[PDB]
Design a protein around this ligand. Structure first.
Ligand SMILES: Cc1cccc(/C=N/c2ccccc2/N=C/c2cccc(C)c2O)c1O
Ligand SMILES: [Mn+3]
Length: 154
């Protein structure tokens, strides 16, 4: 998997917009994820009992997690592929501590793309979506590699 410098800039350009409202993007992304694939919500003992979008939007725990996710992802994306240092801890943690299967990472990747398109339709077009798709695919591929190394078949 490889992105052109132009494509990385498309990824970083939209991320700058994400950073203007990290909490809001995080809430939208997690709500999209939980509504699309309800089983993923079971992984959060602090707010797995949330049902309605209203409850999800009012949840401090959900909001905080969205910030954690986007803050971490932003750090990785800015590395433009050379994210080994930032990725190792995330991968190890997800495999052993949280036990998050690769399919769940695919689900949240879909949610991220959808929310970025919904909130930034004027600039997050086919080119940017394709670039972000490649970036997240690289992200997942590298996490999967670390998973395998640890023997985790998530
Ligand atoms: C994609 C991504 C980028 C940067 C950081 C994270 C952090 N994830 C977690 C951090 C602390 C505890 C749990 C985490 N992930 C939980 C999880 C639960 C259900 C589904 C998915 C898919 C998850 O990654 C992250 O999930
Ligand atoms: Mn996670």
């Amino acid at each position: 998997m490889v992105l052109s410098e132009g494509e990385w800039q498309l990824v970083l350009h939209v991320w700058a917009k994400v950073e203007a409202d990290v909490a809001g993007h995080g809430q939208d992304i997690l709500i999209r994820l939980f509504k699309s694939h309800p089983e993923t919500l079971e992984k959060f003992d602090r707010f797995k009992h949330l049902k309605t979008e209203a409850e999800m939007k009012a949840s401090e725990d959900l909001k905080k997690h969205g910030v954690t996710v986007l803050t971490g992802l932003g750090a990785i994306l800015k590395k433009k592929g050379h994210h080994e240092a930032e990725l190792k801890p995330l991968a190890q943690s997800h495999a052993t501590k949280h036990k998050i299967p690769i399919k769940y990472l695919e689900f949240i990747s879909e949610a991220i793309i959808h929310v970025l398109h919904s909130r930034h339709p004027g600039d997050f077009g086919a080119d940017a979506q394709g670039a972000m798709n490649k970036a997240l695919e690289l992200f997942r591929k590298d996490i999967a590699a670390k998973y395998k190394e640890l023997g985790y078949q998530g």
